[PDB]
């Protein structure tokens, strides 16, 4: 199988027609484990603004502004870290994928 360095993520990925959604498996303090959306080089995508559904605790990302377009679809690069520390090398890095849609 094609190797993946993704650690476990406490959530469920859904590639909708409208958007990308990540449903968290439980409610938690976003300040201490905070996601940011980055490009291929790891820089934060400043034009990306995601939404947090507070009822079901779901992250919502638009395809156009928060993903990297590739031939077969969309790469979704998410870095998650504790914002109360300066220590970034303890962050978790995830690379997810959504297939091309019409």
């Amino acid at each position, epitope marked *: 199988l094609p*190797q993946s*360095e993704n650690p476990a993520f406490p959530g469920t990925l859904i590639c909708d027609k409208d958007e990308v959604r990540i449903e968290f498996s439980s409610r938690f303090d976003m300040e201490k484990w905070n996601p*940011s959306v980055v490009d291929t*080089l*790891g*820089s*934060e995508i*400043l034009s990306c603004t995601y939404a947090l559904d507070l009822e079901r605790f779901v992250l919502k990302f638009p395809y156009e502004t928060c993903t990297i377009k590739v031939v077969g679809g969309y790469q979704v690069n998410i870095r998650v870290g504790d*914002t109360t*520390t*300066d*220590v*970034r*090398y*303890k*962050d978790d*890095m995830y690379h997810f994928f959504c297939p091309a849609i019409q």
Partner: antibody
Amino acid sequence: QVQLQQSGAELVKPGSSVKISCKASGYTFTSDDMHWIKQQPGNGLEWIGWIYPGNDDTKYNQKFNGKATLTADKSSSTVYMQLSSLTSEDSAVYFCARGDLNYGGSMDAWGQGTSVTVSS
Amino acid sequence: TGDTVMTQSPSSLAVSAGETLTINCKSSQNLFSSRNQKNYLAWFQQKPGQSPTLLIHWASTRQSGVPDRFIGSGSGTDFTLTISSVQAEDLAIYYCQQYYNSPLTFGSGTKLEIK
């Protein structure tokens, strides 16, 4: 005043294991990371892993998975690295370094190094 | 794969006392944290028989006691260490390192010489 004191040089046979130590002073032992770094003669610096003595969390360079094991003792403020299944490629100088969490974990203080030679 | 690669250059350099020189470090990943507006890159100096010495952190902030003739600059993926008015005591091997991503990684080093 921040000081890291490593144990003395080691000379061992292939196949064995060694446990080297790093005693820290001058700062709150449980507040910072402790990194370990490998330097083969003439081949620069290679990061092995870190341990956080506050809760014994560890993170390893996957190249050293199963090769290095990090432990910490709060009472003596001492971090230990155990290298197993020693080979000639493990002969190197090993440094401990404080990861100063106030400044993002930068390695601002180093031990003097522990030379480890493996020969049959 | 996926590790941040630090490409340092040149591998060795020979200069006369008093001149100014620059060492280059290129990162395969961006090292800039939007959270605190800092580049997670450090510069180290290592003399024979000694442990590495931290010269610079946050890519441009000198450690206390480090002479102001060491100048770290750059951002994103491109960084430089400049020594203005090189001195005999500056002869050493210099390493760049990123501490933004795990595993932490070093450049291959630049050995600084005279003549």
